[PDB]
Amino acid sequence: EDPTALTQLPDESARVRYTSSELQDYFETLKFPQRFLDLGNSVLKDPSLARTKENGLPLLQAITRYHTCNVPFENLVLHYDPHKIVTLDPAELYTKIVTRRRGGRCMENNIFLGTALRSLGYEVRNCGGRVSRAMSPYPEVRKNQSATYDGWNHMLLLVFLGDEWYGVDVGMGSMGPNLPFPLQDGFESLSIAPREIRIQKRSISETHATGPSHATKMWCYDVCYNPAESKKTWTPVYCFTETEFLPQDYEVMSWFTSTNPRSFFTRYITCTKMIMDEDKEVIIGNLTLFKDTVRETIGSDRKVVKKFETEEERIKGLVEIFDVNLTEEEKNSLPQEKRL
């Protein structure tokens, strides 16, 4: 039958807002220690703190750090699922991430996080971007096309603190900036040592502009994996604009990455949690399952944790290593050609 309603951004009075109690349950899923529970509760009691740099940025730093370490970046809904459809509904996302302790990709993570932050009192714009082909898992695409970008396929947040916007992104696993960054041309920071991140406003290589008089510029997020090299090499990760993206834009973007056969997410299973040094309040590495193999990276050192031999091993490994729990129907929904 013809649709009678299409996806939209609800009017302000109709939008999902996570309650104080649901946000507390999210702080517990994040496994906040006492000092950050206390920080979160002070904002719960005074949302005006979420508008300032001095009181809003520290809780924002803590939320983003524990989120990428405890909420998995995963595509299992396209594999271990009977329907293989992505929901971006903020209430269903809450259940998936807080109650079920599952995760997802950039749109599921950052739609949820945007809803949580606005519910805490933050001013949050949903934005859109393009992942660099330098991040492609296809080797010839990395080699020949690293200056190009995908079609719109990434989500990040801009959060307004005091007098400045900050980029916020908890939905890109170990490729992400993994820090709230000031939206500042030329900002650089250590992020997951030895890696550095950089933000620049610049034209991208792909353009029909015949000269600078007609060029446009994007915000470009790059990383330097090894800043100790004599000549720093910056690897592009994604580019984005400040345009407000809508739920139905993400629906278009997610449809492509979830159903176009050239999206690697339709082809291979992947699941990532970042690794924290809690006392030093920094991320130091990541655990990543790709296809059949779990690897732990700490700084520049990478080692294999497990190469799964069977479906049973991979399923138990998702529980024990990632706290990713599947229903019976989800386990049995994996297509036969993808099983171990």
Place this chain on the structure above:
Amino acid sequence: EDPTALTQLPDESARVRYTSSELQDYFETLKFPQRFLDLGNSVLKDPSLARTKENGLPLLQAITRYHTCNVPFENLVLHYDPHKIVTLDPAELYTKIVTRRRGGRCMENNIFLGTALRSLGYEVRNCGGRVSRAMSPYPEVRKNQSATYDGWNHMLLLVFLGDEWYGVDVGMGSMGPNLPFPLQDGFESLSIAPREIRIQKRSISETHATGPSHATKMWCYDVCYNPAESKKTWTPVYCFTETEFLPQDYEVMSWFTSTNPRSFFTRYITCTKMIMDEDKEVIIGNLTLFKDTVRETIGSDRKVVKKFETEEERIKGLVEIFDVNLTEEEKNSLPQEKRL
């Protein structure tokens, strides 16, 4: 197998250019009269004329007017086609529109036109937009969601003439501006009497902004079907930004509109050409096939031309009314559920 190359914008030296003879063949497909053949030839001989408003705009006006009257806005590639996939390759588009005298939707039309205009010497930026739900063929969507917009799904061009960008769009059938329009906030013009068009820079209804200090603005294209009313009603048609879109962005957008089962293009056959008063150099109406019925509207008056009874009737009508010629494989590719 894993992709070895993804869609990208080619480097300037590898981009498709239409030759002077290919552009001449396009002018004949447009059915230019002699005065516009003369005007086109003068730009083929002196490409610097395409850089000025005084010499570039007249040819631009004539190209866009004859294009929407003579190149069909159609979706038959999703229906009367064995493979039902959309190519955005500018060489294949050339063969489709100039040689085969077929058409397409917004991205096929405007990728082609951008390639042609850049080949004539114009400075052109590919841009992206969202169609208003006020244009939805779904009655309940129109009634309840007219203030909202689709996810990114429209392409238009910005053409820089002299010191001023112009909006150019030959890819929306009867809903389009059907005129090059100056990218000026508040521009209004008659376009297809009695309809008026309007361009405004303004925020759209859907926003997470809690107030105007954090709000964003879009270029918004609205129409007034009946400016004679005591109180003018403006109907939203699409919104866009100046961001340069890439071929791979359009690939994402077209993938949704061509494969998501809530896109109306996946459901119903549609084909439109505009109707010109050639001597008065204005568009006055349109011919539109929708599902099984052809209607002619001239201004505000609409009448049924034909309600097709059989497949043979619809196919002959496409030839006779729209000069849309199908191959035997294309005719026989229509799913049985869609036949008459």
